[PDB]
Amino acid sequence: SKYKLIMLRHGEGAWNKENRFCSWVDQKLNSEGMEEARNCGKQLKALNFEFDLVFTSVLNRSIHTAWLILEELGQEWVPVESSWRLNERHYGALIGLNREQMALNHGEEQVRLWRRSYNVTPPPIEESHPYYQEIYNDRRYKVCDVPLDQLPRSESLKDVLERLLPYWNERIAPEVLRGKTILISAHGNSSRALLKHLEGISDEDIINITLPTGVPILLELDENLRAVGPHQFLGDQEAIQAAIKKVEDQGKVK
Amino acid sequence: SKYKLIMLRHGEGAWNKENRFCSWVDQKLNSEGMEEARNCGKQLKALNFEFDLVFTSVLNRSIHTAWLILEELGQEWVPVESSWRLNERHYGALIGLNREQMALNHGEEQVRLWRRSYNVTPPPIEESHPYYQEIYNDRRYKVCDVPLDQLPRSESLKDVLERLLPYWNERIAPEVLRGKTILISAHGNSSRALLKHLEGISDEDIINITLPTGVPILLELDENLRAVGPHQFLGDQEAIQAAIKKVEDQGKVKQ
Numbered sequence A: 001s002k003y004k005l006i007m008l009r010h011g012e013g014a015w016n017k018e019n020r021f022c023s024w025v026d027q028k029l030n031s032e033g034m035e036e037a038r039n040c041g042k043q044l045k046a047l048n049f050e051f052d053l054v055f056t057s058v059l060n061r062s063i064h065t066a067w068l069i070l071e072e073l074g075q076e077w078v079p080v081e082s083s084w085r086l087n088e089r090h091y092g093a094l095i096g097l098n099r100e101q102m103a104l105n106h107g108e109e110q111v112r113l114w115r116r117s118y119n120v121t122p123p124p125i126e127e128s129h130p131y132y133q134e135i136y137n138d139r140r141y142k143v144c145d146v147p148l149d150q151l152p153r154s155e156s157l158k159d160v161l162e163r164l165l166p167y168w169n170e171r172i173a174p175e176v177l178r179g180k181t182i183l184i185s186a187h188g189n190s191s192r193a194l195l196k197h198l199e200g201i202s203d204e205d206i207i208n209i210t211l212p213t214g215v216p217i218l219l220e221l222d223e224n225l226r227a228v229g230p231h232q233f234l235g236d237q238e239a240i241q242a243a244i245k246k247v248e249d250q251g252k253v254k
Numbered sequence B: 001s002k003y004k005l006i007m008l009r010h011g012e013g014a015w016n017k018e019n020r021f022c023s024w025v026d027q028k029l030n031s032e033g034m035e036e037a038r039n040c041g042k043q044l045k046a047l048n049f050e051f052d053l054v055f056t057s058v059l060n061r062s063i064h065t066a067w068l069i070l071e072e073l074g075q076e077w078v079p080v081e082s083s084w085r086l087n088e089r090h091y092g093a094l095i096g097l098n099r100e101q102m103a104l105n106h107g108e109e110q111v112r113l114w115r116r117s118y119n120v121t122p123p124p125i126e127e128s129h130p131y132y133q134e135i136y137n138d139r140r141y142k143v144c145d146v147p148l149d150q151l152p153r154s155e156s157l158k159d160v161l162e163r164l165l166p167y168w169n170e171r172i173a174p175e176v177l178r179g180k181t182i183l184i185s186a187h188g189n190s191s192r193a194l195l196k197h198l199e200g201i202s203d204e205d206i207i208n209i210t211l212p213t214g215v216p217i218l219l220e221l222d223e224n225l226r227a228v229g230p231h232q233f234l235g236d237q238e239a240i241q242a243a244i245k246k247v248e249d250q251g252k253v254k255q
Helices: A031-046 A060-073 A099-106 A108-116 A132-136 A157-177 A188-199 A237-249 B014-018 B031-046 B060-073 B099-106 B108-116 B132-136 B157-177 B188-199 B237-249
Strands: A003-009 A053-056 A080-082 A182-186 A217-221 B003-009 B053-056 B080-082 B182-186 B217-221
Touching: A003 A157, A003 A188, A031 A060, A053 A060, A053 A157, A060 A080, A060 A182, A060 B060, A099 A108, A157 A182, A157 A188, A182 A188, A188 A217, B003 B157, B003 B188, B031 B060, B053 B060, B053 B157, B060 B080, B060 B182, B099 B108, B157 B182, B157 B188, B182 B188, B188 B217
Parallel strands: A003 A182, A053 A080, A053 A182, B003 B182, B053 B080, B053 B182
Antiparallel strands: A003 A217, B003 B217
């Protein structure tokens, strides 16, 4: 293809073992998630990736993932830019809740709908929510490209794409078209949104895409920045399939 | 004072204890040097610093120092910009040599000129030098604002200032004048060059300035972007003076 792009979601964060929706809560990587980022960097080094620019969200776990990757590559000097527009989907009032408990109380199908639907919007987070203040009082959201009171209080995946697309179009895509090799260090839902756009995945088919943590995703793009074929997970496909199943199973009872 | 910013040189790596000139060799911090960066971050957190921009060199030890400080502050989202123009001074053929060996071979006075004078230039690095290829083959120097073939093969402190000052004037200083809170994560001699300029230190007097590793310098500048007074170090002054003496003593024969 004319261009190649790498994107990924970070490895396990500090709420993964507790199986809680994390979203805009700024949890750090845990020890396993740090190792996943190192493994990504080693895999990218083995394939000779030489990045020219890295894009991340403003959540520290995506930034630390980038930094660990760049250290493994010996590319710490490569410019990094961060934007809330690559943040994980805002899960609203579901932030902090246990996915398995939700499946037990409401049905696995209900949790699957909440997690993977394109159109369904979670209930908005309210000021009484235990995690409201630590999100909206953070300085990183006082200096972003929209006013604090305009930031979402919950998002469908469609909403994520709507706020990610301007950043892709205005900032990332022009660099790809210059022939620069780009790394996008983001999150499960923000990566799914961008894949939906670049691959032309239907609203119905995007529900069945679950991305494994800490696995580089190669996208080959044509002159119009449309995918030439489906995304490719770089690694051992058996391990990758088990990693996908692991994410799916977070929403299953027992 | 009208403006304030933080500058520092990173903590130690292996060649600090071994007493070897490191310069453009891209050596990593060791454990102690990582802890020095965390300690700087804790001091800046105590002072409630809220950075808007961080500037570093392209040597990974300065970048990792910045990342560790930002992590201590919970400010990993703050933009970082890295430039060869903040790199440590290029020590030429002295790269990788032991400073005390140089004092034994050439005398303490000559070593002090090489390390601290303004105008004396180290002998240039040649293609046969054991560290030449790993410096000049590195992609970070193929994508600079100067062609690979025009990058220095050694630098006096004057040469450092000549390549650093445009970056200060054109990229960093405008952000200071916009009221932004800036961190500069740099190196011993690039920091000394900037201090010489900002404080108006004479060509003769700069030879007496040595900076300790891993110690924040909180610089105070007036409306014309010149220092209000001599630089000061955050931390325990007796420990800082002992650390300065240790750096000076690297270039001395042991009595």
